[PDB]
Design a protein around this ligand. Structure first.
Ligand SMILES: [Mg+2]
Ligand SMILES: [Mg+2]
Ligand SMILES: [Mg+2]
Ligand SMILES: [Mg+2]
Ligand SMILES: [Mg+2]
Ligand SMILES: [Mg+2]
Lengths: 223, 149, 77
RNA sequence: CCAUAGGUUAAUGAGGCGAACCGGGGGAACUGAAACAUCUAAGUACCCCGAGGAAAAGAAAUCAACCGAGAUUCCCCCAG
RNA sequence: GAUGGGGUUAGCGCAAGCGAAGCUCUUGAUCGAAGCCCCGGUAAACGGCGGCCGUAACUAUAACGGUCCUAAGGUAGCGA
RNA sequence: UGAGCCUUGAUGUGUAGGAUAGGUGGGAGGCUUUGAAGUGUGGACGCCAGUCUGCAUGGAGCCGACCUUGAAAUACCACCCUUUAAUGUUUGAUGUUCUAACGUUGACCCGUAAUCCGGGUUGCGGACAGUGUCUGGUGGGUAGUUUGACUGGGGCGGUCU
RNA sequence: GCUUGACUGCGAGCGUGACGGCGCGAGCAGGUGCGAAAGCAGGUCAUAGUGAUCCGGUGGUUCUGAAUGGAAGGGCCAUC
RNA sequence: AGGGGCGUAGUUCAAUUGGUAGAGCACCGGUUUCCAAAACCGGGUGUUGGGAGUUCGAGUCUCUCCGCCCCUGCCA
């Protein structure tokens, strides 16, 4: 049934047992077996379940190491914030024209940032940006008066996360070619932000399991 | 309830095998039927003492076995004669009776049973290679020279 | 009577309580059982009225040792 | 089958009585609480067992508090 | 006795504080029968056997019912 | 025969549609004589639409990839979620085959001038029954009590701040 | 229209109750609000909208901490 | 208190279990026969207790706002 490519992947990783961060990151570097450069895919299970409305978590984190995942930033803002956004390196800055370009189907951006005054225009794009999860939300810091900082903070390696229905976290710390030590710092910085996001009523281990995997790599548990 | 086996009760093992077992089991079955005894400090030392006693017994019976062995192994060739057997046709055989006395030479007594004569009943005249079994593991060796009357 | 021949346990009295702590007099009796103990020296079975706690001490102390103490008290068998 | 149970003798000892006191095994209710359940009365009355002129207890796995005391019993305080 | 929370302190810390191991206080996952809930039966088991409305060739009455409560509303016989 | 997890397999129709398109990322890939597509029933299930791959056969093809679509696909993976199925791990639940505890108000022998008792022999039952501790339920069977006052006597009615 | 005085510590002197208690209070201290200010504000036009103590719960607190350091527990404050 | 539970057309009770609330009888009509009654249809009857989330979209899942429940439980 399984081909030789798939069988060697599961031969390299024995996921039936847990592994320590030091060993886990070593395994991740040896799992990079693809024609194209891969990106680490986080597989963290939370004991808390989003089936309770108040237990939902939305957060953001800027990573110094970065991820490489495309970061084209479209900015909805007016006035001095538009110049500050351009000076901060925003690829697209506009309001109604850029919204109408989006309505015309020009979607050459990966991240939308909006000023609170621009929320009126971005709200009209809710049918387009909403299902794709690109809609700016204050809880992730993408709706801010300090538009230049949001453009900055993003660019490099700002990553977003939103809990699913099964209470699982599927983020990305960065590319696979990143150094093991940097990747460990990357996930560690992510982990502390999750602890802050944790509520209180949740009478369960915040994380049900921490695992890491690449594009075609197997899941190695982290301890 | 530690108890020292006296036989091969079921799967518990065999004679002389301390094993942990539920109290009731021994409290009313092994002991009143005599199949075992508690392996208590006092009893266990007596047990091990009897064990070592029989062990040294085996040592001696095998130590004295090598004694008889060497006594007769190293050369100790015999040349006793009896009937009118000569050369060519040695005529008669030498069997459990005369052979035992021969190797014994009024000393190294080896039972007539052990006189394992492999090459038939040694009818031809000449050099003959005869072994003895003083003990089950001891493989003794003797050379017998047959001479005419 | 309900007296253990090994440990000497006998009925004792206490109170039945309740959620209102009402106290009514009661009796606590030992977990006595008539058992036939195998005495090796006489190769015989001797029946004793023993408590469940008494059964535990018989294994620890030995069948002969416990009987020796009973003979000091002095009784029939 | 030995044995054991059992049986027959012979030696000793115990039996019962007696006031309170003492130790132990059991152990109320009336009453008080202005009723009444917890509680009180009370481990009292009473019953049973055992002992003595006394009994019981008794020679620290005790107290103290960083200083020390040195078995048990009894009295006065501590203290309502 | 799963898990979680406290207390204590080896240690680390200028100290703020943190906290190993151990002991300890607690929280009570899991297991858990009858019973109860539930499903039937049983009245020579304890027991129960009402109202409302309409309807006969005159009236009347209501068999012929219908309706509600109820579980179901008194038969034979007897009856100031 | 239970209830568990562990792993694996399988399972994911409101619809548009590629339609047996869980959940969420990763993901432009995918992908591979090592059985390319295929071709033949291994298919069993299922919506009977479809799905996974006895294995044999053939030898590089295979496929992210529009549109609608939540929507982009059992093409891509961690591995999980549901439906679960098997597999590994644990307590129990009965049934049975036992005897050795225990029971015998079965038979026989002795103590023994004995329908008691004890011992022995044997049979039957048997890890039950029965008993102890703890515990749920039931329990006028038996106890200890309560069951107010004002009031043109009391009760009834009414009243009590 | 603006606001939180429905303020905190107190309180001269009175009222009404057998008492437990209840009620009124200028003024003082600290911080407020509204006014430009004088000033007003310690809930509501007033008089009903309520329940003592014990016990337990919660927060705060250098008060206590049964050898000592803690802690438990207790006390005090807030409060159920 | 704590753990299970339920509140859909005037009459009750099904469901869906995110995509989609019927039947019951009462009522008015229509059929059916020579005609009546019985039967057979049409149809007029709904916010799935209520409120807010979650959602592309939920009477459905969740949080609950409650009423009415069954089990179970506690010393102002
Ligand atoms: Mg009284
Ligand atoms: Mg005297
Ligand atoms: Mg008359
Ligand atoms: Mg009384
Ligand atoms: Mg009166
Ligand atoms: Mg006003």
């Amino acid at each position: 049934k399984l081909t030789k490519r798939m069988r060697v992947i599961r031969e390299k990783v024995d996921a039936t047992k847990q592994y320590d961060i030091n060993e886990a990151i070593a395994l991740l570097k040896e799992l990079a077996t693809a024609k194209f450069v891969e990106s680490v895919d986080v597989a963290v299970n939370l004991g808390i379940d989003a089936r309770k409305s108040d237990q939902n978590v939305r957060g953001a984190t800027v990573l110094p190491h970065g991820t490489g995942r495309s970061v084209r930033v479209a900015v909805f803002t007016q006035g001095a914030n538009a110049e500050a956004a351009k000076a901060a390196g925003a690829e697209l800055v506009g309001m109604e024209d850029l919204a109408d370009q989006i309505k015309k189907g020009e979607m050459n951006f990966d991240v939308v940032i909006a000023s609170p005054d621009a929320m009126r225009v971005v709200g009209q794009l809710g049918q387009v940006l909403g299902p794709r999860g690109l809609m700016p939300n204050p809880k992730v810091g993408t709706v801010t008066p300090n538009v230049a900082e949001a453009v900055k903070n993003a660019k490099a390696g700002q990553v977003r996360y939103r809990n699913d229905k099964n209470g699982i976290i599927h983020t990305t710390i960065g590319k696979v070619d990143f150094d093991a030590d940097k990747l460990k710092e990357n996930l560690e910085a992510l982990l502390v932000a999750l602890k802050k996001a944790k509520p209180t009523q949740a009478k369960g281990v915040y994380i049900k399991k921490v695992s890491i995997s690449t594009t075609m790599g197997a899941g190695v548990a982290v301890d | 309830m530690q108890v020292i086996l006296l036989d091969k009760v079921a799967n518990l093992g065999s004679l002389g095998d301390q094993v942990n077992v539920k109290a009731g089991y021994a409290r009313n079955f092994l002991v009143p039927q005599g199949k075992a005894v508690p392996a208590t400090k006092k009893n266990i030392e007596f047990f091990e003492a009897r064990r070592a006693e029989l062990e040294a017994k085996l040592a001696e019976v095998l130590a004295a076995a090598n004694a008889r062995a060497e006594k007769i192994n190293a050369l100790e060739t015999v040349t006793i004669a009896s009937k009118a057997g000569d050369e060519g046709k040695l005529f008669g055989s030498i069997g459990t009776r005369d052979i035992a006395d021969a190797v014994t030479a009024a000393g190294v007594e080896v039972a007539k049973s052990e006189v394992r004569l492999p090459n038939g009943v040694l009818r031809t005249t000449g050099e003959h290679e005869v072994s003895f079994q003083v003990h089950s593991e001891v493989f003794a060796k003797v050379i017998v020279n047959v001479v005419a009357e | 009577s309900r007296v253990c021949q090994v440990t000497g346990k006998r009925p004792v009295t206490g109170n039945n309580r309740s959620h209102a702590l009402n106290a009514t007099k009661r009796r606590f009796l030992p977990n006595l059982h008539s058992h036939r103990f195998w005495v090796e020296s006489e190769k015989r079975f001797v029946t004793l009225r023993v408590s469940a706690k008494g059964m535990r001490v018989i294994d620890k102390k030995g069948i002969d040792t416990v009987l020796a103490e009973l003979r000091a008290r002095g009784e029939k068998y």
